[PDB]
């Protein structure tokens, strides 16, 4: 007979001891551990809710991979590249480039906790997290690999994180900040609680459903399978927060949650916002991006924060406001500078689409519609020179995304600037500036892509110079309009 | 910009390979953090973690112009590792099941449960130290193919911890007055036979240079564990009519030999730079006496 | 005497890098910014364009140069109509 897990599982994490040949601080240095001076004895109270054991892990994960690869093999003849809506193919290119090597980087945030967390349960769950993120990085390289032969843009599934392309810098500056560049307890709070529990879990669920709607069952099944892994390691941040809150560090816990949610939001708005409201074909639109945020993201944050004895972030009103506005401008930025993206943005402004945008965001036509009016007129009169940029956008020194506002009738745009140690920094929100000021040594000498351009690092100091700096290797790699301006026919 | 045709594989592999292996597709050249020497991470160059990586990875006295070219001799990916380990672990779970049905633990020789309580169950601490240490080599190593070997080694370390946890509990059921599952922390911290091992691991876990961490963990500590812990434990089990423990250990030994094999492949790769021979030698010379003292104090406790 | 500024044009959705000259009048500045915006994503208007420090209530005189303005390289300006 076998003895049930509950009977012996406690021994798996009975692994704290009192060091005596080195000190506790040498073994768990605050810069890598982030224990905030709380002693080893106290971290033994760490109470993660969900259990995983090594024999169970290897068996279930073997089965999950068998299924995912069998589906891929079975659907090889689906002709997804050829038959999909361009909006879907661009969804895939953007997804794989922003995500695949980022999942691999998450192995490192997990490893940071595996070695440096004072909580024994955290150390074991993070080992499984290391494994899970390895799976995800490998899956999301192996799957798009078939597409390299079809389209050079799929090379960016591997290449994006090895590039200085602006959106890649945005993703790396975010991930390097919350995953690979901080102590163990920060990673627990910023990655597992704030990003994975707060965003990616629900995002992947939505993405898998969109994939199925798009008729791509290999991808739908891939993303579903990956999402099933999430709770196993995403669970780690809540208990760390509870323990900090119990041990006199509520203010520090709240600050780290506040920063990580904001940072996650800005990247989410540029990468996923536009996909949902502009790329996904109209008739296949389940809901809008704001509806997604309201159904899947906002209330969930509110309730889990309440559950921990934490509060809504100081900026909550701003966040809710941003949901109405930000991604519409980020989309316009991505589309107008499309030649700088490794995917082909869909404009998403047929009259039919504009009606949808109006009912989802009342006043859309009087704001973003004004800009899209000018753009559409230029396309219809074959003034294509006026539909491509001849300068660079100004970029936030935190998010690494262009500084945007509300255009048209309600024109409002604000840059939050800061002089610090003799340099002028510009931010895209009050919150981005605040995040900088919470931890200046993390950020202060970083140069954004425009800082680099002005400093002489990008040669020649021109559009074409920038594109070569950003790592484009051929004409075909640079983003174009997804539908080759066919939308203008409906105008 | 010119027109170029689609490549059959990733741009970094396309010159050399028409159809690279699954291993190469999913494993090769993933540490973007080695691209910018003065800014590993996309942050201020002097951010704390940037300073950590510049000191402990980039500046290691163990040097190679092409770490990214290291290849796991077994070429394991997540998928193939779980194929392999679900096999091995299902075998071990069947061993536990069947030996439990046979009432194995009741058949062991007088006193063996006390030897197990003192010399076997506290290995959960040692194995957890290997787990933590393999995690550290993972996060610091200067190539994704090296880090991947460490990932899988970290998991194997937890595998062994979990066996030890399961068998400590199971054994305590037959022998409830032996302290099994209640005294391991005390033994690890205070029993002289464990102090060599504990000092060794405390010191190893605070060697932060990636090269020193690799060489001390994988070239010194881990082979000492094979020869001075796992093998003598098998011998003792034999002498005490414990036939489960040697079969369990043979499974764990397959894991240890795999770790040995990749480690030896990394040394072969490192030795392409002739300056590395003396560096690796010097770390071995440094760590060996501590490991030999650990082994010696353990072996005599095991037999006492 | 290249002088980078970040400029937000009335009715547009972003701030952009625009490189002006140290001795450009505000009239000339507005013209260099308008080039990256008007008929690209802002409809053209008749009227005079004015330049101010970002978010400021006060407008710079049309004939003031950026040298005279007290502006420093990489500061943020708005370009707006009367
Ligand atoms: Ca690498
Ligand atoms: Ca008996
Ligand atoms: Ca008793
Ligand atoms: Ca017990
Ligand atoms: Ca006890
Ligand atoms: Ca002046
Ligand atoms: Fe993941
Ligand atoms: Fe995850």
From Swiss-Prot, chain A:
Describe regulators of its activity. Answer: Inhibited by Zn(2+) and Cu(2+).
Query: GO molecular function, one example?
Result: metal ion binding
Enzyme Commission code: 1.14.13.236
Keyword set includes Oxidoreductase: yes
Provide the pH dependence.
Answer: Optimum pH is 6.8.
Which residues are listed for Fe cation 1 binding in this entry?
Answer: 103, 133, 136, 230
Cofactor binding notes: Binds 2 Fe(2+) ions per subunit.
The reaction(s) annotated as catalysed by this protein in its Swiss-Prot or TrEMBL entry are:
toluene + NADH + O2 + H(+) = 4-methylphenol + NAD(+) + H2O
| Residues reported in the UniProt entry to bind Fe cation 2 | 133, 196, 230, 233
**Pfam families referenced in this protein's UniProt entry, alphabetically:** Phenol_Hydrox (PF02332)
* Phenotype upon loss of function: Cells lacking this gene show a complete loss of toluene-4-monooxygenase activity.
Q: Does the keyword Cytoplasm apply?
A: no
Q: What keywords is this UniProt entry annotated with?
A: Aromatic hydrocarbons catabolism, Iron, Metal-binding, Monooxygenase, NAD, Oxidoreductase
Required cofactor names:
Fe(2+)
Please report which protein family the annotation says this sequence is part of: Belongs to the TmoA/XamoA family.
Described by its record, this protein's role is as follows:
Component of the toluene-4-monooxygenase multicomponent enzyme system which catalyzes the O2- and NADH-dependent hydroxylation of toluene to form p-cresol. Also able to convert benzene to phenol, catechol, and 1,2,3-trihydroxybenzene by successive hydroxylations.
What protein name does the entry list?
A: Toluene-4-monooxygenase system, hydroxylase component subunit alpha
User: From which source organism is this entry?
Assistant: Ectopseudomonas mendocina (Pseudomonas mendocina)
Taxonomic classification, please?
A: Bacteria, Pseudomonadati, Pseudomonadota, Gammaproteobacteria, Pseudomonadales
Q: Which gene encodes it?
A: tmoA
Swiss-Prot record, chain B:
Keyword NAD found: yes
Q: Which residues form the signal peptide?
A: none
Query: Pfam families, per this entry?
Result: Phenol_Hydrox
How, per the record, is this protein's activity regulated? Answer: Inhibited by Zn(2+) and Cu(2+).
Alphabetically, which GO biological process terms does the record hold? toluene catabolic process
What is reported when this gene is inactivated?
Cells lacking this gene show a complete loss of toluene-4-monooxygenase activity.
Q: In which pathway does it act?
A: Xenobiotic degradation; toluene degradation
Q: What is its EC number?
A: 1.14.13.236
Q: Which GO terms describe its molecular function?
A: toluene 4-monooxygenase activity
Q: Report the pH sensitivity of activity.
A: Optimum pH is 6.8.
Could you list this entry's UniProt keywords, alphabetically sorted.
Answer: Aromatic hydrocarbons catabolism, Monooxygenase, NAD, Oxidoreductase
Q: What does this protein do?
A: Component of the toluene-4-monooxygenase multicomponent enzyme system which catalyzes the O2- and NADH-dependent hydroxylation of toluene to form p-cresol. Also able to convert benzene to phenol, catechol, and 1,2,3-trihydroxybenzene by successive hydroxylations.
**What is annotated about its quaternary structure and interactions?**
The alkene monooxygenase multicomponent enzyme system is composed of an electron transfer component and a monooxygenase component interacting with the effector protein TmoD. The electron transfer component is composed of a ferredoxin reductase (TmoF) and a ferredoxin (TmoC), and the monooxygenase component is formed by a heterohexamer (dimer of heterotrimers) of two alpha subunits (TmoA), two beta subunits (TmoE) and two gamma subunits (TmoB).
Per the record, the similarity remark reads: Belongs to the TmoE/XamoE family.
Recorded protein name is Toluene-4-monooxygenase system, hydroxylase component subunit beta
Q: Which organism is it from?
A: Ectopseudomonas mendocina
Q: Which gene encodes it?
A: tmoE
From Swiss-Prot, chain C:
Provide the pH dependence: Optimum pH is 6.8.
* GO MF term list: toluene 4-monooxygenase activity
Task: Report any one BP term from Gene Ontology.
Answer: toluene catabolic process
Q: What class of enzyme is it?
A: oxidoreductase
SUPFAM superfamilies (alphabetical): TmoB-like
InterPro entries per UniProt: TmoB-like_sf (IPR036713), Toluene_mOase_B (IPR009355)
Which keywords accompany this UniProt record? Aromatic hydrocarbons catabolism, Monooxygenase, NAD, Oxidoreductase
User: Which ranges of the sequence are coiled-coil?
Assistant: none
Name the Gene3D superfamilies on file.
Answer: TmoB-like
Stated EC number for the protein is 1.14.13.236
- Report activity regulation: Inhibited by Zn(2+) and Cu(2+).
Effect of gene knockout? Cells lacking this gene show a complete loss of toluene-4-monooxygenase activity.
Catalyzed reaction equations: toluene + NADH + O2 + H(+) = 4-methylphenol + NAD(+) + H2O
Q: Is-annotated flag, keyword Oxidoreductase? A: yes
Pathway it works in: Xenobiotic degradation; toluene degradation
Please report which protein family the annotation says this sequence is part of: Belongs to the TmoB/XamoB family.
Q: How does it assemble?
A: The alkene monooxygenase multicomponent enzyme system is composed of an electron transfer component and a monooxygenase component interacting with the effector protein TmoD. The electron transfer component is composed of a ferredoxin reductase (TmoF) and a ferredoxin (TmoC), and the monooxygenase component is formed by a heterohexamer (dimer of heterotrimers) of two alpha subunits (TmoA), two beta subunits (TmoE) and two gamma subunits (TmoB).
- Function of the molecule: Component of the toluene-4-monooxygenase multicomponent enzyme system which catalyzes the O2- and NADH-dependent hydroxylation of toluene to form p-cresol. Also able to convert benzene to phenol, catechol, and 1,2,3-trihydroxybenzene by successive hydroxylations.
The name under which this protein is listed is Toluene-4-monooxygenase system, hydroxylase component subunit gamma
Taxonomy of origin reads: Bacteria, Pseudomonadati, Pseudomonadota, Gammaproteobacteria, Pseudomonadales
